[PDB]
Amino acid sequence: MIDKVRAFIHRHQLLSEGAAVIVGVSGGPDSLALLHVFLSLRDEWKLQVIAAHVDHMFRGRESEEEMEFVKRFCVERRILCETAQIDVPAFQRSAGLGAQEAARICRYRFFAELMEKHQAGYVAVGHHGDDQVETILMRLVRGSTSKGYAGIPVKRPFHGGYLIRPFLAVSRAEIEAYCRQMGLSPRCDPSNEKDDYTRNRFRHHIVPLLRQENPRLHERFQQYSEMMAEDEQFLEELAADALNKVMEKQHRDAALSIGPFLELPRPLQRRVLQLLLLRLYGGVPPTLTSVHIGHILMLCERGRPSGMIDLPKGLKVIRSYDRCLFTFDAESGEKGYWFELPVPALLPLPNGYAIISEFGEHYPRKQAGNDWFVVDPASVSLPLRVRTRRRGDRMVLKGTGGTKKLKEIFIEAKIPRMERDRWPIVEDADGRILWVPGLKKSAFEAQNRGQARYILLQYQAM
């Protein structure tokens, strides 16, 4: 207090460094005490204070008494007393949310105004070590545990500057000690009546049982927060880096290479995933880490290469062999095509490739291969069609081999699915499959029989 809390300010630095603060205030006992200690240490440390209190809806003696008794304090110590009030909790929740959510979102939206619109650098709110305990357990059983378990964060990146909770250092016990000791009306609240909030019940029955189990609880909990604070952020760095070294890069939406990823250590596999999605919008509500992050991970240790997963806000997750497409977009789409094959001609295909046909007095002399194919005008009925795969397609194989299903092939040649579909097949008028570009040749490739007339097919890119 004055120094336990000043030490704290110093321990966690960047808290007492500059000139501009917006210190918020709500209830009674707690919020007033803050200001006080602030004022004194702001003279002591080069600094302009600005009280800021918002009144939410539930009103009565609370809204008014609270509000006016801060007012008379701002004056009682020459302090700009930036006031406000919103009773559109009722119209806020008529826009999407529950209760205590609208609290912090609105409250903070406001502090944001003050910070930006007042050139302030820090915004401090009093959060006692008990506040902390509360949130830990609260968030222990709720399940957030991750990085987010963490606790109440000492100081964090707020808008422009940072946001500071220097009362984290100290019991609500010692906040009442300091409140009465250094002047103020009824210490704590005899009107806590309100087991309305999960939050409260912890504080009303649960904490105390702990409290009894150990006098110095708000302590064993801070040292905890801090342990996990540092532990957590380290990893974070690693995570981030990992992410980059596993992200197939600049797309519309991002890909992830399963191999390198999974060679990672799980701790990080987790994180980069967490981050990934966060990037991909911002920690959404119905997003059950556990369930989801798990499922992704499952989807990648699978044996089965084809893999779909449906996610929150219609976000979709796909494995194609070693790739991992994240598109909340969609994939279909639709596909398919059927073309006659003009000869000679240069036909472009919907997969950035194309086929070239020409006539040749002499027999082709280019190396053995696949992306080319030779036909006898005679021994087959034209014209030539090139179209997309079809339910039961088959063919017969240059040498021995026999007859084989097209399906059977694409999968052996381990080709992506969206590929398989847009992939060209080449048939004769009679519907006989002749040659599958860069994949397999039939048995009806015109052998050298005689230097009659010849057709040449080159499959090539763009």
Next chain:
RNA sequence: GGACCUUUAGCUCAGUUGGUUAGAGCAGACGGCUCAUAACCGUCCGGCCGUAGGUUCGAGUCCUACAAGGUCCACCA
């Protein structure tokens, strides 16, 4: 042409030794908790078990073919 395996709701899996009454999870829609920057709690909607043919009093469960999706071979090299 040769060998092995998969298939259950939009998506991921369970499905006892042939009974029958098919079970979870994600998404979707719905209802709550969050005085924290974020990954929780409950309800509901969605079942032709890939087609089609058999063996059985009986089939999701066993056999056949076909089909798709898989792991090898072979042809191709």
